[PDB]
Amino acid sequence: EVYPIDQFMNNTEIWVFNTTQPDPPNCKKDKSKSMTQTATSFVRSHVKNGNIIEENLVGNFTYFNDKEKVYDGIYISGESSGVYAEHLYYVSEDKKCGLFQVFAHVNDKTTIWRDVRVSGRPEEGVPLELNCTKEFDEYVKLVNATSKSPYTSECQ
């Protein structure tokens, strides 16, 4: 069914825990700032050559699903990795794990990938909901993609 991306993104820190993005930078995370009824303002952060880069972005809520009552996606203008749309298509029962379809365009090159994102700092001995990670693993096998985790406990 459909999970409110506006609720998932209303968390202090959302980390990219696993991704099929090719060669992803380390320590990818979003930090919420504020939301209106129709858009969220947030800081998208990652590390490049030891430097923390922070982009102040606006995600405009929209609908991938048919019934158009629950926001499940955002449009993004000017994102530095070329991501123009993100579709939240699954969230765990405990609301800590979310699966994303990511649509990107840079330099006459248009790509898609998928993420497991975690609504908080992952722990040492607390695994994510099994259906969440397994559904992602099913996709990774189906498209024969390579998956990587941008996260380490050393991430600021």
Numbering used by the authors: 48 to 203
Quote the authors verbatim.
CirpA1 targets human properdin, leading to potent AP inhibition. One protein, subsequently termed CirpA1, was shown to inhibit AP activation of the human complement system, while having no significant impact on the CP or LP at the concentrations tested. CirpA1 significantly inhibited the formation of both C3a and C5a via the alternative pathway suggesting it acts at the point of C3 cleavage. CirpA1 showed comparable activity in human and monkey sera (IC50 = 1.41 × 10−8 and 1.38 × 10−8 respectively) but only weak effects in rat serum and was inactive in guinea pig. Using this strategy, we were able to purify CirpA1, A3, A4, and A5 and determine their structure using X-ray crystallography to a resolution of 2.0, 2.1, 1.8, and 1.9 Å respectively. Overall, the structures appear very similar, with the biggest conformational differences in the tilt angle of the C-terminal helix H2 as well as variations in loops between beta strands 4 and 5 (L4-5) and between strands 7 and 8 (L7-8). Despite their high structural similarity (r.m.s.d. of 1.4 Å over 105 Cαs), OmCI and CirpA1 bind their targets in very different regions of the lipocalin surface. In addition, OmCI displays a second mechanism of function by binding the proinflammatory eicosanoid leukotriene B4 (LTB4) within an internal binding cavity. The corresponding pocket in CirpA1 is blocked by a cluster of charged residues, precluding binding of a hydrophobic ligand in this position. In addition, the CirpA family lacks the hydrophobic pocket seen in many lipocalins, suggesting that their mechanism of action is likely to be exclusive to their capacity to form protein–protein interactions.
In this study, we identify a family of complement inhibitors from the hard tick Rhipicephalus pulchellus, hereafter termed CirpA (Complement inhibitor from R. pulchellus of the alternative pathway). Functional and structural characterisation reveals that members of the CirpA family directly bind to properdin, inhibiting its ability to promote complement activation, and leading to potent inhibition of the complement response in a species specific manner. Whilst many molecules act to control inappropriate activation, Properdin is the only known positive regulator of the human complement system. All CirpA structures share a lipocalin fold with a short N-terminal α-helix followed by an eight-stranded beta-barrel and a longer C-terminal α-helix.
